[PDB]
Amino acid sequence: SMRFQRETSGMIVISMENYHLLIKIIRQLSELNEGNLSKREIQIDAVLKIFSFHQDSIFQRIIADLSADKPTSPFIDSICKLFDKISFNLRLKLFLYEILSSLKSFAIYSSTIDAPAFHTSGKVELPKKLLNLPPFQVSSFVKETSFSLNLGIGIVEIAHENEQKWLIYDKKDHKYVCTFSMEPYHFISNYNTKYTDDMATGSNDTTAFNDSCVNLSLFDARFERKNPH
Amino acid sequence: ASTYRLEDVLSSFYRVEKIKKINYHQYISKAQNDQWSIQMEFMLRKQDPKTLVALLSRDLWCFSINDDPVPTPPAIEHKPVSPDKIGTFTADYSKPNLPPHYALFLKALRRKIYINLALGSHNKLIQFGNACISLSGVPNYLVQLEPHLFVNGDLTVSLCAKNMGLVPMKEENLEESFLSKHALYLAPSGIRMHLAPASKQGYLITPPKHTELLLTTLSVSHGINLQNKKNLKWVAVVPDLGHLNGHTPTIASYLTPLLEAKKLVWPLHLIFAQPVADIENSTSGDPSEFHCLQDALDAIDDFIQLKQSSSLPFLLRHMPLASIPDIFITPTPVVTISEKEQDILDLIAEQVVTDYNILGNLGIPKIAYRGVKDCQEGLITTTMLQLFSTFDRLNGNDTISKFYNMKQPYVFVKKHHELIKVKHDSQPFIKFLNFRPPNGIKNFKSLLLSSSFKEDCLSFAPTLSQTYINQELGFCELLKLTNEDPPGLMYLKAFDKNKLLLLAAQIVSYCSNNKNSIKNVPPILIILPLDNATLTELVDKANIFQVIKNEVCAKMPNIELYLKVIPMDFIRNVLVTVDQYVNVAISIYNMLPPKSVKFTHIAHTLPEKVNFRTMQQSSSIIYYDSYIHLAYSRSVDKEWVFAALSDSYGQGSMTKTWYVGNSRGKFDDACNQIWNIALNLASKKFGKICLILTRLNGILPDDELMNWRRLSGRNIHLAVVCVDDNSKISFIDEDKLYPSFKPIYKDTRFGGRMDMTRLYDYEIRDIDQDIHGIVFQHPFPLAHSQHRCAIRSGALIKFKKCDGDTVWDKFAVNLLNCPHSDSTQLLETILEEFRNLAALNVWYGLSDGEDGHIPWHILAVKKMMNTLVHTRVKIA
Amino acid sequence: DAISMHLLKDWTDTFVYILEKLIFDMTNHYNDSQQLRTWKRQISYFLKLLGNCYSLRLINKEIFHHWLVEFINKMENFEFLPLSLHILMIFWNDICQIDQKEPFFLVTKITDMLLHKYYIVSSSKSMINDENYIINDIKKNNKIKLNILKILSSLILKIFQEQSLEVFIFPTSNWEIYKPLLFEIVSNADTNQNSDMKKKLELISYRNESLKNNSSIRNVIMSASNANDFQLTIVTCKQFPKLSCIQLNCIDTQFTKLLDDNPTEFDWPTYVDQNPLTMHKIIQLILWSIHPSRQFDHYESNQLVAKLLLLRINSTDEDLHEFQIEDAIWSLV
């Protein structure tokens, strides 16, 4: 079967055709059967995995399945998705290769879903569960190699803060308005001044005093002058 | 325009009951009974686990909620036992110090909650003592349920999630690689213990027939009875009796064995471990020395060359989880002092308390309480809704009374030669405005002293001296000797006794040369490069500078040299901007011998409302004139005492540390000297002066309170304050509309508008320094020490510069002893002073722009007690 | 607004031009040790100035890194490597720390380039001109080469420690092996890098479905006997000896093999255990005039296999198996 099926697949690839026959009932049944018993999966794992992989090797069937979910009313569960999840849970240590194939299939499925969601988004909400299962870094990669303890305490995560500290307060309408950001060729230590004279030259000579690469009224720069004792 | 929707900001207090009366029976331990209370308590709990019961050491206390009567224990076949005192109380007790029935009702409620929560789950969760850690490693954190009763009768529970590294160990860990660098803990009590050495079997023995009876007792307390389990591994333990009495061992040198009491047997399924956090130099920058450019020039030079009843104290007592430290590092260096010489510790505190983050927080990062978002799904909601009346969290509008945005305080700075005020959000522009300090200049002469890489410190020392001269901060005429050395440098190698002696002889020959000069021209300082930004080499560079000062002072007195440390990376990273050395220059300017005069202080502006004080209303209100802030702390192990003292404008700053040790005479000496320095600063101001001493880290024990009640009097009015930094109570913010940096952070085009530059009266307001003050409606429990609640709790709160629902940073203030009446006015005055003392902390070199909500002396005390407890001391 | 980005890109362009000019001026001037002593503080000062401008956002950081990876990729003489690799190690904290595909492109490009530079350095001698006399004394040559090998080994080690995504799919040259020789050296066989290397050999080696190949493990010393079918006997049909493996594509290749360089190509496929035995059968079975050089070609194929011998096992015996097969032919008659 694998040899004949493999040859047919090769011919199809050569024929530049992604078209495939539809047998939704059989694949789903097989997946469910494999998922139900751990021991059953363990026996003849290579034969079962190779066949499933060949069936899902083609993206033609997968794209069609995705369309149905968008098409189906409300939040009803998908049998194929459930089977895939069961296989992912169930397929632990069956074979070094088996794990790789499963991971590849999962990764491919997420990509297919993303490709499908190129227009306005049809909501699925099963992506997060799928995304968590397959990862290329840290703990999840090792992972590839609960009776009633459900605390449900739901701890918070570190949310990344943005990189603009400086904002601008509009003191009239009492609201923040815009991000203060000069390009870094503006902050020059200014030397060409003309305040080498003395203070109290006439009155209100702040025009030749406030010279720097920020206006001093953006800090409420108050003078200090008193009659001393 | 504080249009904050006070509803729908989620707190961490789940309301669980509604109390207008609570009754109690106390059975005294009359006539020294033959453990009758200890027997009859578990004999009462075996009937039903719903009862409310607790015990002082042999006294019995039974409790009862609003209506139902208190249970009576199963007595003898004839009953001679009557209760000793009946009573009831309500939700208005004596608040600043708890009477000893509310502090027993809280323990009884917490024990009932943990026992019911352990029994309802599938035998997978035990009480660690103010915790509930799973036997499997599913959460890998401590969940902490803390009950409390408010003043209107709202019995709430607060949830905490401490992310400590408590991992359970098994039979495949009893080797040297695990037991060498872990700290073990007895699980249903919380005592620490070390494993006894083996008995030629491999660190596990069979249980004796007696002590299996203890397992039957585990069916009645803590509800985790594994009698049905066909496998059970037993081990021989021995705990430390000091940790049975609160005396945690010396946290500087952990993992060291100590004398024993007696051996014990214990199931290996419940013994936990805490891992030694480790420290390394760095990464990503070639620690194998190819980041050295002279290696590249060496390789191109080579190419050029080639071109040619023994367990009931462990089943009854508990440790309150504050007496176990968060972290403890591995190398643990040794400093040495005398019985009169306390110099190296004050040196390390002086040169770690006022450097921004260039030291790098050299130890291990903090272990803080991560904030709970929601708890709707799991099992503890089911167990609370089964056990009690209701379970839903308190909104913002029920606990928060006063929410208001604080002002922005001003600061003094000298522009050209005028002395202008300016907003405190303008520190990094200090080069691009030619700002110069108002309080005059301080001058020194510098001497870099490196031994690693001369070709980069040759380029580093003149540009630092030039950026110190080029702003008007005095003249650092760097040192120059006779020979071919470029000035202000001495490239040695092998820092040792003989070369330091010769260098001290060279410096004292220079000082004998320059005889006749003014006093203020010669203070000198030595800059040392840390080859690795850790603690073990900071203490060694402090030792090297102390050897230099000892060899200089005996050959010539009155010479005053100082120590500044700089990490080697900050010298030889080529990404270090010259807009950054400026900050390092300010970190020399706050060490020169005019020590308590720094870069700038608060501007002391005119008030907003005048409010001429006429006839009062005539109660005992005071209307003080000058406050004085003081922050002292004491470590978890009872040795170190840290202190920082500041004026109401940040003027008369002192920062000091005292290694008391195991004794209790040096502790009273240090607590007397703290009041000595406080009164020394108090004898400078007007009068009607109220010092405010703030104890860090929640817990205020009884010995320090006895000391501060003995020392105080009519010389000054104190006002005790408890301060909490870590978010044990975690208000999680959830709204999208009020803080108007969130529409600008959501898509960067929502507000996004032009400035309309004819209305040009704006101000650059830097976020992370826009603090909001809260005064709560009711008093709060302290985060530790369940023996004293507070009065008039409040908080400083700093948002996170991000969009959406996330926890906000907070700083909890709790008044404990007000001198006059009307404590809410005193709390608002304390918060309005604390905002100014928090805004000062960037101009002083205490930290970078990371916490604008903590006042500066409390942050100084926290940095000292974070990075200085780990060194162990020897007295010689 | 785009005028500012235009100006920033232009100044980034002239900065990388001046850095390239100085690094080539090194080899375009080096004949005087007073000029070299000036040149060392020259490169040190320019690197200090370039870092001080790069940390101030005065240089567009994404054109500079792409130029940098192009400049470490394009070089061919090794006497610029120890300085250019130090320039790489400076911005190492910003190239590989980005947390066909646009995302994490410099990381995969930098590990492909560094493995290629490792191979080219480990190939031959350090001199590239070979135009002047007394070219090489061996000791300074190996002393120089061991340093560059150490630097590239440590950088590949930090690449493998860094990336948690771990996508080393090589589209250009499929799986030449140098990295186990690296990872045997460090950590004294730490099993995490070992298990990641086994998953690496599963993923990035592009393992073929090989359904027939799974069957190959079963094959042992086996022989072939052909028996005529009952139906065949009536029509006097002749049975074809049974074959453990087909290698039909291989059979097809043999027919068109003549007047082409078949010998170097077969080497690529390790079919010596099965195809070589099969090849003998093909040579024997169908060519009288079709394949004049068929026996000689078979000998050449066998000879090539014989030349490429690494172990006594499955080499000398092949001849024994052939003798057994010849004996088997006699049995069939």
Curated annotation (Swiss-Prot), chain A:
Note: Present with 1730 molecules/cell in log phase SD medium.
Family: Belongs to the Mediator complex subunit 12 family.
Functional note: Component of the SRB8-11 complex. The SRB8-11 complex is a regulatory module of the Mediator complex which is itself involved in regulation of basal and activated RNA polymerase II-dependent transcription. The SRB8-11 complex may be involved in the transcriptional repression of a subset of genes regulated by Mediator. It may inhibit the association of the Mediator complex with RNA polymerase II to form the holoenzyme complex. The SRB8-11 complex phosphorylates the C-terminal domain (CTD) of the largest subunit of RNA polymerase II RPB1 at serines 2 and 5.
Subunit-structure text: Component of the SRB8-11 complex which consists of SRB8, SSN2/SRB9, SSN3/SRB10 and SSN8/SRB11. The SRB8-11 complex associates with the Mediator complex. The SSN3/SRB10 and SSN8/SRB11 kinase-cyclin pair also associate with the RNA polymerase II holoenzyme.
Superkingdom field: Eukaryota
Subcellular location per the Swiss-Prot or TrEMBL entry: Nucleus
Name of this chain's protein: Mediator of RNA polymerase II transcription subunit 12
From Swiss-Prot, chain B:
Gene Ontology molecular function, alphabetical: cyclin binding; transcription coactivator activity
InterPro entries: Med13_C (IPR009401), Mediator_complx_sub13 (IPR051139), Mediator_Med13_N (IPR021643)
Source taxon at top rank: Eukaryota
GO CC annotations, alphabetized: CKM complex; mediator complex
Effect of S712A: Loss of function
One GO term of the biological process aspect: positive regulation of transcription by RNA polymerase II
Localization (cell): Nucleus
UniProt keyword annotations, A-Z: Activator, Nucleus, Phosphoprotein, Repressor, Transcription, Transcription regulation
PTM remark: Phosphorylated. PKA-dependent phosphorylation at 'Ser-608' is enhanced by activation of the RAS signaling pathway.
Principal location class: nucleus
Function: Component of the SRB8-11 complex. The SRB8-11 complex is a regulatory module of the Mediator complex which is itself involved in regulation of basal and activated RNA polymerase II-dependent transcription. The SRB8-11 complex may be involved in the transcriptional repression of a subset of genes regulated by Mediator. It may inhibit the association of the Mediator complex with RNA polymerase II to form the holoenzyme complex. The SRB8-11 complex phosphorylates the C-terminal domain (CTD) of the largest subunit of RNA polymerase II RPB1 at serines 2 and 5.
Family: Belongs to the Mediator complex subunit 13 family.
Subunit structure as annotated in this protein's UniProt entry: Component of the SRB8-11 complex which consists of SRB8, SSN2/SRB9, SSN3/SRB10 and SSN8/SRB11. The SRB8-11 complex associates with the Mediator complex. The SSN3/SRB10 and SSN8/SRB11 kinase-cyclin pair also associate with the RNA polymerase II holoenzyme.
Protein name (Swiss-Prot/TrEMBL): Mediator of RNA polymerase II transcription subunit 13
Organism: Saccharomyces cerevisiae (strain ATCC 204508 / S288c) (Baker's yeast)
Gene: SSN2
UniProtKB/Swiss-Prot annotation, chain C:
Keywords: Activator, Nucleus, Repressor, Transcription, Transcription regulation
Molecular-function annotations in GO: transcription coactivator activity
Domain of life: Eukaryota
Entry's localization field: Nucleus
One GO cellular component, as annotated: CKM complex
Gene Ontology biological-process annotations: negative regulation of transcription by RNA polymerase II; positive regulation of transcription by galactose; positive regulation of transcription by RNA polymerase II
Family: Belongs to the Mediator complex subunit 12 family.
Miscellaneous comment as given in the Swiss-Prot or TrEMBL entry: Present with 1730 molecules/cell in log phase SD medium.
Oligomer and partners: Component of the SRB8-11 complex which consists of SRB8, SSN2/SRB9, SSN3/SRB10 and SSN8/SRB11. The SRB8-11 complex associates with the Mediator complex. The SSN3/SRB10 and SSN8/SRB11 kinase-cyclin pair also associate with the RNA polymerase II holoenzyme.
Function: Component of the SRB8-11 complex. The SRB8-11 complex is a regulatory module of the Mediator complex which is itself involved in regulation of basal and activated RNA polymerase II-dependent transcription. The SRB8-11 complex may be involved in the transcriptional repression of a subset of genes regulated by Mediator. It may inhibit the association of the Mediator complex with RNA polymerase II to form the holoenzyme complex. The SRB8-11 complex phosphorylates the C-terminal domain (CTD) of the largest subunit of RNA polymerase II RPB1 at serines 2 and 5.
Designated name of the protein: Mediator of RNA polymerase II transcription subunit 12
Organism: Saccharomyces cerevisiae (strain ATCC 204508 / S288c)
Range covered out of full length: 198 to 542 of 1427
